[PDB]
Chains A and B, each alone.
Chain A
Amino acid sequence: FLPLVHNIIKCMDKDQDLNALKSKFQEMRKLISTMPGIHLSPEQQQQQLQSLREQVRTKNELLQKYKSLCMFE
C-alpha cells in the first residue's frame, strides 16, 4: 500500500501514531480478504467449478432427453 508507506515516512521524518493506524488497516484488509471463504488456491477452486458446471449441464441435458422421449402407452 502506497498510503501506508507514505504515512510511515511522514511519521518518521516529520521532525503521530501512523504506524498503529497502518497496522490496523493492514489487519482489516487481511480480514476482508480472508472473509471471501476460499481457503485453498483459486486454481483448483475454478477447476472444480468448471467440472461442476459441466456436470450440471450434462445432468440437465440427460433429464431433458429423458423427459422428451415419452411415447409409450
Chain B
Amino acid sequence: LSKMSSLLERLHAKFWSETIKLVRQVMEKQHLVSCLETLQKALKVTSLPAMTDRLESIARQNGLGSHLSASGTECYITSDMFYVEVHHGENPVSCPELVQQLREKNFDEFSKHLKGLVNLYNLPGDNKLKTKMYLALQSLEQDLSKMAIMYWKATNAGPLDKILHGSVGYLTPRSGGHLMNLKYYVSPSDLLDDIILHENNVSRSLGMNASVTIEGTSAVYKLPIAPLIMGSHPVDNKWTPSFNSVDLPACFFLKFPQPIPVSRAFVQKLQNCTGIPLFETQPTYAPLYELITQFELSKDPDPIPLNHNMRFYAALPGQQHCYFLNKDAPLPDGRSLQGTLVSKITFQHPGRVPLILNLIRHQVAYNTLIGSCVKRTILKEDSPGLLQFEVCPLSESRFSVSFQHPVNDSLVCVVMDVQDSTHVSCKLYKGLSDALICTDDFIAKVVQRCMSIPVTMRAIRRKAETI
C-alpha cells in the first residue's frame, strides 16, 4: 500500500560512475531465489534460443538426460517426441503434425504435451516398460487411424450420423499439438454456420472436444505391439486379434471431464468387455439428475450464488416459464436413481468395444440434453406461462413432460424414451374425453431432432396449444 521502495529507499539500501568493482573482487562465491534468469519469457520474446535454453535449464533442474552441440537447438528426450523443426527407437521424424501448430510463434504445445507424455509414460519399470511398453502402445495406437479411414470410406453419406452420433469414427491423429480424442459431446442444436460446414474431418480442435488418453498402472492386459489388422473390412470394421503379446504396462484411461450420470445396466454391460467396470470405488448413489444438472451448467455459472433448490424455472419463446426435475424422488422402481459421480476412466485394451462406449455416451448426452432447459435462467414468481413439468426418470432414459393442455382440465404427460441415439420416442397418452391437442409423429420427430426440454415446452405452448 505504498511505493517507498522504488526510488526513495531502494537505491539508498543497495548493500555510480566509479563504484562498479563488483565483478572480480566480490565474486568469490532459478526456482524461488533467482527470478531474473527464470523470467526469460518477460525480458526477451519467446525465440528459438530462449526456449532451447529454458528447456535445458528445466532438464538440469528437474532431471532429464538431454543435450546438444551448443545453445540454439534442443530436442525432447522421450519415446518419440524427439523432433527438430526447420536413433534409440524411431528415427528423426519431421511430420507436419508437430510442425503445423508450433510453426512460428506458438507457445502452448511446448510444455504441456511433453510434460504430459512424460508423466504418463512414467512407472516403476526400469528399461522394461518406461520405453519398451511405451513404444509398443504408441505403435499399437495406429489401427484406429486405419479404422477411422475405413469408417469414413464406408460412411460416405455425411459425417453426422456415423462420426458423432450412432457409433465411433470421429477420431483424429494423435501426434504433437493434438492428442487422441473422440466425439464425446453430440450437441446438434448449437450455434451452427447460419452437419458443420467443413472441407474434411475435424481434428477435434476447432471448438470443444473431449481428451482421450492412454495410461495405466495395473491394467497390464494382453494386446498387440504392432498394427496387423489393416485391410478394409466387409461393412463397417473388423477386430484385431493379438496374442506376439506381452504384459504391456499400459491401458486406455481417458479423461472424463464431468461425472456424467449413467444407468446401472450400462455399467454392468460394459463391465464384461474390458475386464471390470468403468470405475472401482464406492458408487455415489445420490440423486443423479440433481448433481448432473449442476455439473453441466457449472461451466457458464459465475461466482454469484444460484440457490436453485430443485427449482427449474426458465424462460420461454416470448415470456417466462417454470419446470421441475423430480430429483431425489424415489419412484416406483424402488431404489433411487443410481449415481456415477466419479472421474475414474481407467479402461483396458481395445477389445470388443465397438458399442461398449457409444451406448453410455448417447445415454449421458440424452441426460444432459434433458436438463439443458435450465442453464442460466433464474426467474421465479412468473404468473404468466410457468409450463411446469417434471422429468420422471422411472426407467433408464425414460423422461416425461407435463403440460396444461386445453384438451382436459389437468396436465398432459408424454412418454419420452431414447430409443435410438438421435431418434428418441416421443409418444403421448391422451384422455378418453380430450380434444386433439396431441400432435402427430411429425412434431414428435421434430422435438427428437431438437432434443431440448425448452424447445418442447415452447412447441407445446405455441404449436400444440393452438390457443
Contacts and interface: CB of A to CB of B under 8 A. Distances in A.
Contacts of A23: 17, 20
The binding surface of chain A is classed by DSSP as: helix
Contact of A12 (B17, B23, B43, B44): B23
Contact of B23 (A2, A5, A6, A17): A17
B85 interface: no
B304 interface: no
B37 A9 contact: yes
Given A2-B44, A17-B20, A12 B27 contact: yes
A67 B205 CA distance: 70
A18 B23 CA distance: 9
The binding surface of chain B is classed by DSSP as: loop
A73 interface: no
B36 interface: yes
B32 interface: no
Interface in B212-267: none
Nearest to B21: A19
A11 B23 contact: yes
B27 A15 contact: yes
A16 B27 CA distance: 12
A16 B43 CA distance: 22
Contact of B43 (A6, A11, A17, A20): A6
Instruction: Sort chain B's interface into a size bin.
Output: under 10
A19 B20 contact: yes
Interface residues of A, number: 13
B27 A5 contact: no
B22 interface: yes
Contacts, number: 21
Interface in B28-68: 36-37, 43-44
Nearest to B26: A12
Nearest to A24: B17
Contacts of B37: 9
Nearest to B22: A19
A36 to B, nearest CB: 22
A9 B36 contact: yes
A41 B27 CA distance: 42
B36 A19 contact: no
Contacts of B23: 11-12, 16-19
Nearest to A27: B17
B33 to A, nearest CB: 13
A2 B43 contact: yes
Contacts of B20: 17, 19-20, 23
B271 to A, nearest CB: 59
A9 B23 CA distance: 10
Contacts of A5: 36, 43
Interface in A1-34: 2, 5-6, 9, 11-12, 15-20, 23
Interface string A57-72: 0000000000000000
A9 B37 CA distance: 8
A53 B36 CA distance: 47
B107 to A, nearest CB: 18
Contacts of B36: 5, 9
Contacts of B17: 23
B50 to A, nearest CB: 11
A20 to B, nearest CB: 6
A72 B369 CA distance: 88
Nearest to A16: B23
Given A6-B43, A19-B20, 10 more contacts: A2-B43, A5-B43, A9-B37, A11-B23, A12-B23, A12-B27, A15-B27, A19-B23, A20-B20, A23-B17
Interface of B: 17, 20, 22-23, 27, 36-37, 43-44
